[PDB]
Amino acid sequence: SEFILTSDKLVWTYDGHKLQIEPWGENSLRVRATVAPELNGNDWALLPAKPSTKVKVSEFEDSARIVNGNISAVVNGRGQLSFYNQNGKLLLEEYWRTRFVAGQGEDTSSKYFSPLTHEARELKPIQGGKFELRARFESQPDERIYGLGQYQQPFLNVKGCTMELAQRNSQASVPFMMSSLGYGMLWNNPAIGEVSFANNVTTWMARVTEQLDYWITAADTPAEISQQYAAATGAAPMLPDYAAGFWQCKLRYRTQDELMEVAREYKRRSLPISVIVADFFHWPNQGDWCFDTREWPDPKAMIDELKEMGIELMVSIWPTVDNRTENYKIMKEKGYLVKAERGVPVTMTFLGNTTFFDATHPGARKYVWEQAKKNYHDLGIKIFWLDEAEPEYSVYDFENYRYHLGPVLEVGNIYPRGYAQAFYEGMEEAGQTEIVNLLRCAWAGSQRYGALVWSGDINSTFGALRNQLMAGLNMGIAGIPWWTTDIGGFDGGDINDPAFQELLIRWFQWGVFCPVTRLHGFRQPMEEPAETYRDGIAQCMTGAANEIWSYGEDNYAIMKSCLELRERLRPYVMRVMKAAHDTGAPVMRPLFFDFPDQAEAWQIEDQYMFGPDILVAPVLEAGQRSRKVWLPEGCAWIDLNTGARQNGGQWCDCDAPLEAIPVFIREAAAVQAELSIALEHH
Amino acid sequence: SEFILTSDKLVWTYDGHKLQIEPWGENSLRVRATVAPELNGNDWALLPAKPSTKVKVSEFEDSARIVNGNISAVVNGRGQLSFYNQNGKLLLEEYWRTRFVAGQGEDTSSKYFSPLTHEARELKPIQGGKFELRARFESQPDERIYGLGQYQQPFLNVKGCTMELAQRNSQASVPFMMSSLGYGMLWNNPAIGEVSFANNVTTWMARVTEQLDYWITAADTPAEISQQYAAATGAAPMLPDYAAGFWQCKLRYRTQDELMEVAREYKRRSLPISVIVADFFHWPNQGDWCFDTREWPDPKAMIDELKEMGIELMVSIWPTVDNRTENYKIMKEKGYLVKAERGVPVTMTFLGNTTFFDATHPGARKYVWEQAKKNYHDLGIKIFWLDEAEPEYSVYDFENYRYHLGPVLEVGNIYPRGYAQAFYEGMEEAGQTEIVNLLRCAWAGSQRYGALVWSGDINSTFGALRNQLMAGLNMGIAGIPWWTTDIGGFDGGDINDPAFQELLIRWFQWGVFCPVTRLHGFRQPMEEPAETYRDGIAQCMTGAANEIWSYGEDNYAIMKSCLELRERLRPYVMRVMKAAHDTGAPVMRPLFFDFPDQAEAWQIEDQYMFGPDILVAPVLEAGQRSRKVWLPEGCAWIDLNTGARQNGGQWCDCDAPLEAIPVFIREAAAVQAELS
Amino acid sequence: SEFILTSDKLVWTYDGHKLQIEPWGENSLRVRATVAPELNGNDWALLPAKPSTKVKVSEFEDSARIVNGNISAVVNGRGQLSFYNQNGKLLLEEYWRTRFVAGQGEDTSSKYFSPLTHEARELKPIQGGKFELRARFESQPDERIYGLGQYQQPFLNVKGCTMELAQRNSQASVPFMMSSLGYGMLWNNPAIGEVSFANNVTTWMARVTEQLDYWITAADTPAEISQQYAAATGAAPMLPDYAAGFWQCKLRYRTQDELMEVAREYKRRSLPISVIVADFFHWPNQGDWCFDTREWPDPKAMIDELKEMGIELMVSIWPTVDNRTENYKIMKEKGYLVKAERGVPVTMTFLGNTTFFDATHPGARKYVWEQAKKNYHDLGIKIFWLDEAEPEYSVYDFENYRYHLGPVLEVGNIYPRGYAQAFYEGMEEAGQTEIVNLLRCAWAGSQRYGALVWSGDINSTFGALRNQLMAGLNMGIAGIPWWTTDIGGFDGGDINDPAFQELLIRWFQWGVFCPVTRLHGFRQPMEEPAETYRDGIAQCMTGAANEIWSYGEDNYAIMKSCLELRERLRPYVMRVMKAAHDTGAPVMRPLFFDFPDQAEAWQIEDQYMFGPDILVAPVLEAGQRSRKVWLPEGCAWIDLNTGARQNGGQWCDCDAPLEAIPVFIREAAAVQAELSI
């Protein structure tokens, strides 16, 4: 084996395998490995690193070492790699089980000595092709793991869980993890695959790839890790003011008159409303990207009236292009569409045979943006709903599809980032600042393209609500601070069912304390279109009403006070949004983000912090009217609902009537006054 | 290496490779090879063999031999196989190029000695799966090769050609070959692949298979080879009388009234017409298998009036099932549909998203037949047009589809045979005899299911007509005697274009001397449907008129006389059809079939025999008004068009005006008196 | 969706998917699924079922149910399956995440409703070939999982772990699992793959297969699950008496004289010795399966003399066949060897180019047995060391190898079971009873072929000792009662190193309370052969001495008292072996096997039961001289080393000097009397 060492780079080589470790931001290292002649030029989610001045490269015995601030990497003579912090504590070590490695006998006194023959950096050649990559690391008994994106599962800590590295409706792979051991790690590789944080071994897998690529950072607090990650992959922009208010939506307002009636009724009742939404199939065909003027006769007039009312319109964008449209003909000519490797050249069959635009193709991004610009942005629409962002193949046979940047197996997970990029870059070029679009999916770095992500088409149950809480917290840790849900869930809520009405209330109450407060759903009983087809184009149904007055008088009163509460929170929300932009901190965050020195903060998964000053303890079960709440040590807490003061460092058997969830304010935080919390003496 | 010999079976084995050779009908052997533990039970196109007279299995110093009448197989100690006829002449030998084979050094004095390392029976393992098979044989410089099915190419002799073993619109792989060296061979394996008759080596390839399987037969004449093949894979039924008359069709008679007006016009003018046809999209949706009563308000009244007129109705069957239909729901429940391996579960996107019924699934065959029986056969339709029989995937990605019997890569080519089988078996069970359906495709043995095959959606050119002549002849050699074309070709004929009208006439004149005489096409100028969609179902266009009066007076006169001639030919046609049923002889035959001892008969590709008594020399070029015609030795020939007698064994500079193609009758054959 | 129900079989079908559930032994069900036209005839590890008492198949609402004693299966109208015990408790449920299944909308009120589109029985077609199978089940928060075979990892409970379903040196996939929820499950499928017991979902995977196949059983106690599993896949035989004594081995006694001098020295010192072993490369070439008479001049005289001394000889069998031998030519002719799919036709390159005999080929099994019979068994050898049983490919590229029964990807894991079968059937046919052979690997049902499994070529460390304890316990739960290790580990032990000597003693002390007590290793400093080659055949090195007197006088005294202790335990060991044969109970068992109602028995992984009457608490750290020990409630416990009585239901801060590990005897068990007498 051979080291090639310079003052700021460590390369190890043996039999064509090249391992390269280098600084990539303060307290951070990038790690690449290949068996090709050279590393390629793909940086994926990593921005160019601002240089590190005090990088120390050294050799000792048969080993080499690279130190960059609070992280160091050691590679021994056998090419085996481990990472340490400034205190010499082991952060992460490769998993090797061999008797012979890098042309040398393995040391029989090591746990690495084994006839099993597993390598830590397995670049397994695909016959005729590239490589199937497994990167193996030792599991650690104390290790708790967070981030990875948005998964539909009741686990905040994902140690012992296995996550698919793929994009499907209601899932988002954003592969940055944060460890309780004091490091964060980005898997800087958009290949379809899997990460297993199994108790016995950690394995990251890429189905098809040219090389291993990851980024690792070390710091004493979660806040510092989140900041270092945002410096590596990009900060969220500043959120525009309107986005902190109430977003009203449903599947679907079918006509201009129907949408405007709802907007006007909100104003007629003196209710807060910042954003109203025209959902999908408001267009003539998929891939036209314009209003159908039979249902939407004068969209400019709608937008102008809504502006006068203080309301922004957001419109559904679908990435689908129906093969009967004019844009299909042009986009096919130009090579701007995704391709099927085998079988009929159709990627989705929903209400027509469509092909997704290729969001990895720079030309296709520009083309789609310029259509949305002409037909929507030029009329005054400032927010786009980038739906189906995965994209939602009718069948998730990732092997069967190919993009501009290569087979979906190799590059597929970056699609939603390109989709966000198309609109963000277009809107920025058109002169807009503080851009936010609603994205169903993301990859590493999507935050830099103003991606407000929502958790997609989940069912309307308490089980779903519990999953969304974990998912949103993990999305924030993965560097996606702008995140939300369909208040009430998407599918299955009957507006006349008491059981659903109870869920809607609990979900709405939680929603007040989400980064964005957004009511959406496909409510029952659903209504079929008058005509199944029109001119051969299949017509889209609607669900039932989904406004805060649609669920009876008692529920209206609760939701109205939720809206009023959210308006009072807006100044605080904007401060926390500014902090996300400045520091990479999430908006909704696990307890350990603000209280990393407290053991309960690393164990509790049903409470969180909404910024630094609000402790939230959602009600996640039907019929529940009280719950246990841990109040962190280090300050006093003001009960939002009673005005009562409680000392930190204790548990509360807290009241949780249907009318409110337990919420506490850090005593004397500016937000306490902004909420007008008072206690009356009767 | 080891031989395991019994009185009627030769087995050779080394390192798990098992080669088994046994009699399979008179003068014929079956050859199988596997590296699996045992041979499987798949017989594919081979029927159970009648036990053979005089099979003899012998062992020699190093070798073993099995003889069955006029064929023998010799396997040497290295497992290398060659075939000989009863005169000891070499028929066929395996191609080997190795230095070491079956655990032994190769003989340096043999052409088999080579460091290249190519085996004759290469079962190359597919990782995780089955085998990719190549069977190699030495080429022979004097070998002429015929059969293989229906390929769109101007070659009767296919030595030096490479043929895809797959089913596509206008192509049919029917993998029986006949060699001028005195053998025939069936590749008894429905796998997607290829047959290369390259000058340097012959290679049969199967992409995915469990085992090598082929059938080889020897005889002194082509007629005996055809007979032995029909004995092995099944005889054509007897053709029913109505099928020898005129079949009138176009794309498409859109309504009951439109069809009936054409039929009434034929009868009004005392013109022959035996079959009239309702083409595709006469149904409400794909997979309903019934008339759409909006355009066909009383199918029984149509059938009854046609019955009065002496005319049979044939209807289009498509094997597609639109995913919005009731039959889709039920067939999907029962697992009766073809499956996509990856991607959207749609096999065709023509006028809707459809999935083909699985013709390899015996349940699906029965289900589809019973729909056709209920909606058509019970009304008195007894001829079906089994279109899209390949099946016609929108994209021919064979690796992406799977049938009941397995991946299309392994079993795909048998689909058209299953499709014919579904209707034949159903029709027979309903009491019908002399069954014929119009199939777009076939595999080996399709003839036994009454498959009248046509050459599909070719263009309307003289180039296409030349190709069809070769293809039809090769189909007959491949054991498909009932074969025809769209007279005029399918695509691109403008009815007002004089150049197309000349092609139509020449093609029609040829069609009189085809096994079935059938007018069809998609004529220009075409017309879009009034409504593009109705209830969200895409509507099907039509072409222009395609009746014998549609092309002017001169052309009407010529086509009318052609129909009248075909009527006078019918007794002869039925005799030739009966001989096809009895002996496996094709109806349209290359010259060497009837004159195998004459050199010219193995060279000439632009003449043929319509049965044993009629020599036909089609005009295959625009503007041509004469051509050279070779008259075979051994009889005198009567010019059909002048009555002049010419001695055989000479070339004629023969007149070929637009009104007639050169045709000669064997002097004193019964058909001579029938045509005068 | 359609049910086809008979009195003893439930079939559900949609779009060619066939799900079939039926009784397969008392309290047990077999589950199969296929998209092929029919199920194939592969039973793999399952023996023919004894027809069960009171099976009931019924259809209710849109569902169907099949009950067989204490287990039942319910399949709903969407083809979704779950299992329950006789008390209606949920045992195991399928994992579904779809919006549309079996031609029906999914129920939006269920956790099954999801746009992700994951099926529970995913038979994903391989283009041109068979199927890549994933069987998904919901994880359960309370569930603790045991068994699966032998994995090199410090986990008894493997919930949260992912195990490779493949055979490698030091690993054995024996895919029977036992759950704390009250069921056991056999993955009756020898395909290469993986089982993931992740916290978020349980997934079994087969890389290539024709069909889903598994067997599930229900009972109130671990002992009943073990009995039901042994009924389904076969019981261990009765162990022969000699097997409970001391096995002396090393890598390697190179000559007859060297081996015999070791055996003689054991007798001269009045030490117990029941088995002595001639390790690998005692033969002229790989595939000869005989003694090289240059080093072993009179094997029959050696065997007769050892018989006279009360010692059984075991000989190394390697499954390799060198391409220059006469058996290679013959076995190649007959198709008895494993095949490489691509590349040079060589499966291993260790001391020559060899090819493994095909243990899935019944002809090859018989051929190899008859060679061993002729050259070893006919002379009086009664025990074979079936080494390299995985088999140990030089490169574990499973995709590149094919067996008689198919590609290694589809069938590979059954090889070690075939290998044990070859010798057991052959030995049984020659009239031998109570057959035991030493196997390096196993599959489901290997126990019925007398397979004493050992944990292979592990390193000589305390970390390895800890892993071995977990592995052997899990092997027992997977139905392999006869299990052992190399005392001291295999690789890295220098005989002059005090640190290794300490590990040796701790490992030897644990060894006394393993199903078999066997000393083996490749001890340093190693010795190269005099000549690297002889007649072109590469010669095999040896390690240093590995006898109980080889490590100094103080260590000798400790190992001597260990051997004497083992001899006093033999009557008890034989009773526990008889129980293994009769009931399927393992010999070394987790605490919960004997004490299933006590919470600590399901948490503690560093103590175990050696049969029902001996509680063992090994020392697993260097320099440790005391450790904590939990004594189960329900009986009193007698300290083996002092004689002190202690009440059950407490922790002892227990003495653990170098000279003894903490061990307690159930008061009034017959073994207490046997040890004091």
XYZ file of C-alpha atoms in Angstrom, chain B residues 113-487:
375
model
C -8.973 -28.855 -33.695
C -8.799 -25.190 -32.755
C -7.815 -22.995 -29.808
C -10.954 -20.856 -30.441
C -13.038 -23.038 -28.036
C -16.510 -23.107 -29.595
C -18.808 -26.010 -28.672
C -21.588 -27.498 -30.830
C -24.042 -27.675 -27.893
C -23.307 -24.602 -25.806
C -25.584 -24.355 -22.765
C -24.154 -21.157 -21.306
C -25.454 -20.643 -17.721
C -27.328 -17.429 -17.029
C -26.364 -16.271 -13.522
C -29.204 -16.997 -11.122
C -31.249 -18.450 -13.993
C -31.418 -20.942 -16.841
C -29.280 -21.214 -20.047
C -28.443 -19.274 -23.190
C -28.222 -21.982 -25.879
C -26.215 -22.032 -29.117
C -26.357 -25.094 -31.366
C -23.679 -24.941 -34.048
C -23.363 -26.981 -37.262
C -20.831 -26.892 -40.081
C -21.948 -24.966 -43.136
C -21.770 -26.804 -46.452
C -20.851 -24.979 -49.691
C -23.575 -26.727 -51.747
C -26.393 -26.374 -49.172
C -29.601 -24.550 -50.093
C -32.045 -23.903 -47.248
C -35.798 -23.306 -47.282
C -38.659 -22.784 -44.821
C -38.324 -21.083 -41.397
C -41.664 -19.250 -41.701
C -42.527 -15.804 -43.050
C -39.785 -13.211 -43.415
C -40.024 -9.890 -45.211
C -37.114 -10.419 -47.581
C -36.498 -11.328 -51.266
C -34.858 -14.742 -50.658
C -36.474 -18.151 -51.202
C -33.160 -19.946 -50.554
C -32.071 -18.538 -47.160
C -28.515 -19.920 -47.075
C -26.380 -16.912 -46.115
C -29.314 -15.187 -44.376
C -29.924 -14.673 -40.692
C -33.489 -14.866 -39.353
C -34.765 -13.513 -36.052
C -36.623 -16.155 -34.026
C -39.366 -13.815 -32.823
C -42.926 -12.786 -33.714
C -43.556 -9.274 -35.074
C -46.304 -7.840 -37.319
C -45.615 -9.250 -40.850
C -43.136 -11.866 -39.583
C -43.795 -15.431 -38.378
C -41.062 -17.703 -36.994
C -42.101 -21.282 -37.890
C -38.736 -22.899 -37.345
C -38.795 -25.918 -39.682
C -36.094 -25.894 -42.364
C -35.606 -28.108 -45.450
C -32.084 -28.619 -46.867
C -31.174 -29.525 -50.433
C -28.756 -32.091 -48.899
C -31.756 -34.358 -48.091
C -32.873 -33.542 -44.542
C -35.383 -31.373 -42.716
C -34.957 -29.978 -39.190
C -37.363 -28.512 -36.613
C -35.911 -26.300 -33.890
C -38.338 -27.513 -31.231
C -37.898 -24.588 -28.925
C -40.102 -21.470 -28.641
C -37.417 -19.213 -27.133
C -36.649 -15.792 -28.496
C -33.467 -16.064 -30.520
C -31.938 -16.319 -33.953
C -30.971 -18.754 -36.720
C -27.853 -17.805 -38.678
C -27.220 -19.756 -41.901
C -23.925 -17.948 -42.388
C -21.482 -19.200 -45.059
C -18.904 -19.968 -42.304
C -21.124 -21.764 -39.745
C -24.801 -22.467 -38.946
C -25.951 -21.261 -35.482
C -29.324 -21.638 -33.789
C -29.641 -19.498 -30.661
C -32.146 -19.436 -27.754
C -31.845 -16.500 -25.312
C -33.286 -18.428 -22.349
C -34.000 -22.157 -22.301
C -33.805 -25.260 -20.144
C -32.517 -27.624 -22.869
C -31.576 -28.238 -26.484
C -34.396 -29.891 -28.447
C -34.667 -30.551 -32.179
C -36.201 -32.965 -34.641
C -34.458 -34.107 -37.812
C -35.795 -36.169 -40.697
C -34.338 -37.598 -43.935
C -35.790 -38.586 -47.310
C -34.925 -38.610 -51.020
C -37.574 -36.014 -52.017
C -38.998 -32.737 -50.619
C -42.492 -34.267 -50.662
C -41.435 -37.029 -48.257
C -39.775 -34.483 -45.937
C -43.011 -32.439 -45.840
C -45.001 -35.602 -45.105
C -42.702 -36.651 -42.264
C -42.863 -33.138 -40.782
C -46.697 -33.079 -40.895
C -46.723 -36.489 -39.212
C -44.488 -35.024 -36.441
C -46.308 -31.707 -35.809
C -49.848 -32.390 -37.177
C -51.689 -32.140 -40.487
C -53.685 -29.198 -41.713
C -57.393 -30.020 -41.454
C -59.437 -30.302 -44.636
C -60.226 -26.782 -45.863
C -63.975 -26.013 -45.928
C -65.392 -25.259 -49.404
C -66.345 -21.633 -48.596
C -62.665 -20.756 -47.912
C -61.720 -21.477 -51.569
C -63.991 -18.657 -52.840
C -63.469 -14.903 -52.816
C -62.904 -13.117 -49.479
C -63.848 -9.382 -49.572
C -62.467 -7.115 -46.858
C -61.188 -3.627 -46.154
C -60.132 -1.462 -43.275
C -62.933 -0.998 -42.438
C -66.678 -1.452 -42.959
C -67.740 0.839 -40.087
C -71.433 -0.087 -39.863
C -73.772 -2.998 -40.519
C -75.382 -1.022 -43.379
C -72.001 -0.227 -44.979
C -70.930 -3.887 -44.941
C -74.327 -5.089 -46.166
C -74.322 -2.605 -49.072
C -71.021 -4.027 -50.316
C -72.409 -7.579 -50.043
C -75.619 -6.565 -51.838
C -73.643 -4.936 -54.654
C -71.636 -8.161 -55.257
C -74.895 -10.138 -55.433
C -76.662 -7.475 -57.567
C -73.883 -7.777 -60.173
C -73.660 -11.632 -60.082
C -70.064 -11.454 -58.851
C -68.533 -14.269 -56.802
C -68.213 -13.653 -53.065
C -67.843 -16.338 -50.407
C -66.669 -14.445 -47.323
C -67.151 -10.800 -46.278
C -65.369 -9.287 -43.296
C -65.977 -6.866 -40.421
C -62.572 -5.429 -39.464
C -61.406 -4.123 -36.095
C -63.068 -1.610 -33.738
C -66.627 -2.673 -34.516
C -66.851 -3.298 -30.752
C -67.606 -0.907 -27.837
C -64.159 -1.385 -26.287
C -61.172 -3.712 -26.618
C -61.853 -6.840 -24.590
C -65.673 -6.821 -24.937
C -65.594 -9.184 -27.979
C -68.995 -8.113 -29.296
C -70.619 -5.811 -31.821
C -71.261 -2.199 -30.810
C -75.018 -1.986 -31.434
C -74.795 1.759 -32.155
C -73.094 0.881 -35.485
C -74.256 -2.751 -35.758
C -77.869 -2.624 -34.537
C -78.908 -6.179 -35.460
C -75.969 -8.559 -36.018
C -78.257 -11.598 -36.297
C -80.230 -9.919 -39.139
C -76.929 -9.152 -40.940
C -75.753 -12.788 -40.527
C -79.150 -14.138 -41.676
C -79.254 -11.967 -44.811
C -75.646 -13.001 -45.635
C -76.679 -16.659 -45.128
C -79.510 -16.123 -47.682
C -76.971 -14.669 -50.102
C -74.597 -17.648 -49.729
C -71.984 -15.580 -47.837
C -70.076 -16.218 -44.568
C -69.235 -13.345 -42.195
C -65.814 -13.236 -40.532
C -65.207 -10.854 -37.610
C -62.044 -9.255 -36.244
C -60.855 -10.560 -32.880
C -58.178 -8.484 -31.111
C -56.376 -10.197 -28.167
C -56.251 -6.870 -26.289
C -58.213 -6.134 -23.100
C -58.743 -2.446 -22.269
C -58.250 -1.863 -18.548
C -61.648 -0.078 -18.258
C -63.658 -3.136 -19.358
C -65.481 -5.717 -17.263
C -63.508 -8.532 -18.886
C -60.273 -6.831 -17.731
C -61.475 -6.937 -14.114
C -62.416 -10.624 -14.312
C -59.384 -11.709 -16.375
C -57.033 -9.824 -14.046
C -58.735 -11.589 -11.061
C -58.135 -14.960 -12.695
C -54.542 -14.325 -13.864
C -55.483 -14.649 -17.555
C -53.484 -11.643 -18.758
C -49.908 -11.229 -19.988
C -47.671 -9.443 -17.421
C -45.108 -6.665 -17.757
C -41.906 -7.459 -15.802
C -41.225 -3.769 -15.180
C -42.958 -0.465 -15.779
C -46.637 0.312 -16.258
C -48.788 -2.860 -16.619
C -49.792 -2.032 -20.218
C -48.671 -4.099 -23.244
C -50.248 -1.919 -25.985
C -51.403 1.700 -26.224
C -53.347 1.577 -29.535
C -56.697 3.393 -28.974
C -56.510 2.676 -25.231
C -54.319 1.045 -22.584
C -54.653 -2.692 -23.102
C -53.090 -5.901 -21.864
C -53.004 -8.992 -24.103
C -54.797 -12.150 -22.986
C -52.333 -14.942 -22.246
C -52.685 -17.488 -25.054
C -50.274 -19.880 -23.222
C -52.724 -20.071 -20.282
C -55.346 -22.806 -20.915
C -57.850 -20.976 -18.706
C -57.380 -17.728 -20.613
C -57.838 -19.507 -23.988
C -61.114 -20.981 -22.765
C -62.281 -17.648 -21.298
C -61.698 -15.701 -24.537
C -63.249 -18.397 -26.722
C -66.354 -18.442 -24.524
C -66.748 -14.664 -24.932
C -66.469 -15.051 -28.731
C -68.843 -17.996 -28.608
C -71.483 -16.054 -26.678
C -71.310 -12.890 -28.795
C -70.444 -14.202 -32.273
C -70.379 -18.000 -32.767
C -73.864 -18.505 -31.237
C -75.184 -15.996 -33.839
C -73.743 -17.984 -36.815
C -70.270 -16.475 -37.291
C -67.982 -19.474 -37.894
C -64.828 -17.753 -39.135
C -62.655 -15.583 -36.879
C -59.970 -13.099 -37.825
C -57.349 -13.629 -35.097
C -55.439 -10.385 -35.601
C -52.465 -9.085 -33.586
C -51.449 -12.719 -33.086
C -47.733 -12.144 -32.276
C -48.800 -10.362 -30.053
C -48.093 -6.852 -31.323
C -46.510 -5.193 -28.286
C -46.271 -1.426 -28.762
C -42.585 -1.952 -27.980
C -41.036 -5.358 -28.786
C -38.987 -5.550 -25.555
C -39.291 -9.334 -25.188
C -37.312 -9.375 -21.900
C -40.037 -7.195 -20.320
C -42.977 -9.637 -20.622
C -43.946 -12.951 -19.010
C -46.526 -15.603 -19.823
C -48.126 -18.454 -17.878
C -45.504 -20.860 -19.320
C -42.678 -18.459 -18.437
C -40.734 -15.414 -19.593
C -41.381 -14.420 -23.206
C -37.603 -14.871 -23.760
C -38.071 -18.585 -23.000
C -41.514 -19.364 -24.480
C -42.726 -16.331 -26.414
C -42.848 -17.684 -29.957
C -45.617 -20.189 -29.140
C -48.208 -17.405 -28.456
C -49.793 -17.384 -31.984
C -50.177 -21.159 -31.821
C -52.011 -20.871 -28.480
C -54.207 -18.136 -29.951
C -55.219 -20.318 -32.938
C -55.650 -23.248 -30.495
C -58.083 -21.277 -28.292
C -60.519 -20.784 -31.154
C -59.952 -24.117 -32.889
C -60.545 -26.158 -29.716
C -63.597 -24.105 -28.788
C -65.074 -24.333 -32.286
C -64.477 -28.099 -32.393
C -66.091 -28.547 -28.971
C -69.111 -26.568 -30.299
C -69.460 -29.184 -33.111
C -67.774 -27.320 -36.025
C -65.699 -29.276 -38.592
C -63.203 -28.131 -41.272
C -62.304 -25.127 -39.105
C -60.317 -22.224 -40.566
C -59.439 -18.942 -38.840
C -57.375 -16.113 -40.246
C -54.187 -15.829 -38.118
C -51.605 -13.043 -38.413
C -48.858 -15.269 -37.047
C -47.906 -18.887 -36.346
C -45.397 -21.201 -34.702
C -44.517 -24.798 -35.585
C -47.661 -26.889 -35.714
C -50.099 -23.962 -36.058
C -51.440 -25.795 -39.144
C -53.164 -28.361 -36.869
C -55.351 -25.556 -35.432
C -56.709 -24.503 -38.809
C -54.451 -21.495 -39.060
C -54.851 -19.677 -42.370
C -51.957 -17.242 -42.001
C -51.647 -13.898 -43.800
C -48.531 -11.798 -44.083
C -49.785 -8.777 -42.134
C -49.385 -5.064 -42.476
C -46.942 -4.723 -45.399
C -46.699 -1.700 -47.689
C -48.310 -1.536 -51.151
C -45.290 -1.803 -53.449
C -43.877 -4.192 -56.011
C -40.953 -4.721 -53.577
C -43.493 -5.950 -51.046
C -45.176 -8.251 -53.608
C -41.836 -9.899 -54.468
C -41.182 -10.455 -50.741
C -44.624 -11.993 -50.209
C -44.091 -14.575 -52.940
C -40.874 -15.787 -51.215
C -42.470 -15.671 -47.770
C -45.559 -17.691 -48.814
C -43.435 -20.362 -50.453
C -41.225 -20.620 -47.370
C -44.311 -20.847 -45.127
C -45.500 -23.852 -47.123
C -42.108 -25.545 -46.694
C -42.387 -24.743 -42.963
C -45.654 -26.746 -42.961
C -48.214 -23.895 -43.195
C -50.191 -24.742 -46.359
C -53.055 -22.299 -45.722
C -51.470 -18.927 -46.412
C -52.470 -15.655 -48.089
C -51.833 -11.888 -48.323
C -53.739 -8.626 -48.481
C -54.221 -8.325 -52.277
